[PDB]
Amino acid sequence: NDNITIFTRILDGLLDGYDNRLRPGLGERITQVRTDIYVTSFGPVSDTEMEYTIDVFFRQSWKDERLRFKGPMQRLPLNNLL
Amino acid sequence: PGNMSFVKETVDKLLKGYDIRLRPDFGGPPVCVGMNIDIASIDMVSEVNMDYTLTMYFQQYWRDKRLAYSGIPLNLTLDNRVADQLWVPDTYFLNDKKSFVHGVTVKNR
Amino acid sequence: PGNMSFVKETVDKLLKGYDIRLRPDFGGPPVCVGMNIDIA
Amino acid sequence: PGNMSFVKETVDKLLKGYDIRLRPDFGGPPVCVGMNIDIASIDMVSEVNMDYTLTMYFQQYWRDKRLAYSGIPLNLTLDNRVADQLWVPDTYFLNDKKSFVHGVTVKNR
Numbered sequence: 001n002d003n004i005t006i007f008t009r010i011l012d013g014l015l016d017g018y019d020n021r022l023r024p025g026l027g028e029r030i031t032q033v034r035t036d037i038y039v040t041s042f043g044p045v046s047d048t049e050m051e052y053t054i055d056v057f058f059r060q061s062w063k064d065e066r067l068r069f070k071g072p073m074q075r076l077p078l079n080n081l082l
Numbered sequence: 083p084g085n086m087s088f089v090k091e092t093v094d095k096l097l098k099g100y101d102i103r104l105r106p107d108f109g110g111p112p113v114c115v116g117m118n119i120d121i122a123s124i125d126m127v128s129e130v131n132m133d134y135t136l137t138m139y140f141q142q143y144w145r146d147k148r149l150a151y152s153g154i155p156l157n158l159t160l161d162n163r164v165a166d167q168l169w170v171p172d173t174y175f176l177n178d179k180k181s182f183v184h185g186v187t188v189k190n191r
Numbered sequence: 192p193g194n195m196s197f198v199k200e201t202v203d204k205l206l207k208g209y210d211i212r213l214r215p216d217f218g219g220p221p222v223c224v225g226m227n228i229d230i231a
Numbered sequence: 232p233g234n235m236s237f238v239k240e241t242v243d244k245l246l247k248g249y250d251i252r253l254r255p256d257f258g259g260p261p262v263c264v265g266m267n268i269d270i271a272s273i274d275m276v277s278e279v280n281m282d283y284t285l286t287m288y289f290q291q292y293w294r295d296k297r298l299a300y301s302g303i304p305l306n307l308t309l310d311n312r313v314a315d316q317l318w319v320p321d322t323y324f325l326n327d328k329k330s331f332v333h334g335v336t337v338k339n340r
């Protein structure tokens with residue numbers, strides 16, 4: 001009953017004053033972006049244009065210190081509009 | 083007072099504070115998205131491309147306890163532009179190569 | 192008058208409080224929409 | 232530690248009051264835009280179409296006094312959405328037939 005309210009409160013309190021123009025750790029650290037690919041399908045290859053099509057899930061991960069939070073659960077699936 | 087202003091204020095009260103960034107019953111049990119399809123046509127099938135073109139009316143159906151309203155017996159139908167103000171499932175077609183929602187006059191939603 | 196300010200404050204009074212989400216005469220009888228086409 | 236807030240407020244101070252409409256030193260001497268191109272590849276060259284297709288990295292340099300800052304020694308890289316918040320030259324290719332900026336994951340700016 002209360003979670004869908006306390007998490008909107010948390011998230012609104014999580015990105016107020018948050019600036020997305022800046023890297024996480026802009027002033028102190030290099031940002032290590034862990035990356036991964038799942039190839040859903042490969043091809044077709046084109047000999048005449050010398051190209052090939054590939055369809056993938058492209059996955060990235062990094063740590064943004066601004067967004068660490070405390071709450072009843074340890075992982076939030078957010079709407080991609082965020 | 084009156085239906086027009088009454089309905090306007092009811093919808094505003096529904097959407098006031100509605101967080102699109104959280105799914106229905108967030109944190110609780112999963113939301114069940116029932117869906118059904120009416121096929122307009124399969125337009126063409128191509129061996130050289132190993133694909134086919136499908137046109138369909140695609141529909142989805144779920145509860146959002148936040149959008150429950152009282153005092154109005156009607157099934158409210160709203161302009162499609164409300165779709166950008168509501169949470170909707172992230173449904174997608176895995177083997178889709180290329181697709182689009184029809185947009186003549188106004189986007190077909 | 193022909194004052195453009197008079198027209199502006201007239202249009203703004205039409206749009207103020209206007210809700211695009213609700214059809215004309217909502218809850219009432221259906222809206223009659225008259226189609227017309229000129230073929231190019 | 233406090234650098235994050237410091238640089239945030241620095242950038243906000245730069246943008247606050249900044250006018251997109253006016254070129255650097257508007258009314259004063261012209262702005263010098265220096266350009267570089269790194270050719271990625273040249274696609275098909277067509278006699279039948281009397282055209283050729285080119286892919287490149289295209290870079291432009293200019294100085295805008297409104298964006299000077301002193302507290303941060305870094306060459307400050309910013310997310311590409313800032314380009315919509317800054318004046319940028321209206322360079323265009325006078326002999327192009329069809330062209331686009333790449334957007335593979337984010338628009339390549």
Ligand SMILES: *[C@@H]1O[C@H](CO)[C@@H](O[C@@H]2O[C@H](CO)[C@@H](O[C@@H]3O[C@H](CO)[C@@H](O)[C@H](O)[C@@H]3O)[C@H](O)[C@H]2NC(C)=O)[C@H](O)[C@H]1NC(C)=O
Pocket residue numbers: 155156157
């Ligand atoms: C608002 O829409 C709902 C549907 O979302 C309408 O409720 C549905 O009304 C129909 C009758 O118009 C009900 O059908 C009946 O159902 C049973 C089987 O469940 C069967 O014995 C009958 O032959 C008949 O088909 C239907 O059950 C009911 N519910 C659903 C989920 O479809 C409602 O009438 C609409 N209200 C207004 C004011 O338009």
Ligand SMILES: *[C@@H]1O[C@H](CO)[C@@H](O[C@@H]2O[C@H](CO)[C@@H](O[C@@H]3O[C@H](CO)[C@@H](O)[C@H](O)[C@@H]3O)[C@H](O)[C@H]2NC(C)=O)[C@H](O)[C@H]1NC(C)=O
Pocket residue numbers: 304305306
């Ligand atoms: C931020 O970017 C600027 C861009 O101008 C960097 O300036 C760099 O300054 C150095 C030092 O003057 C330039 O070195 C050049 O080297 C050769 C000798 O090796 C000589 O021919 C030139 O007289 C000149 O000194 C360098 O060209 C210049 N640009 C670049 C791209 O390095 C500056 O270093 C950057 N700062 C930081 C903190 O990253």
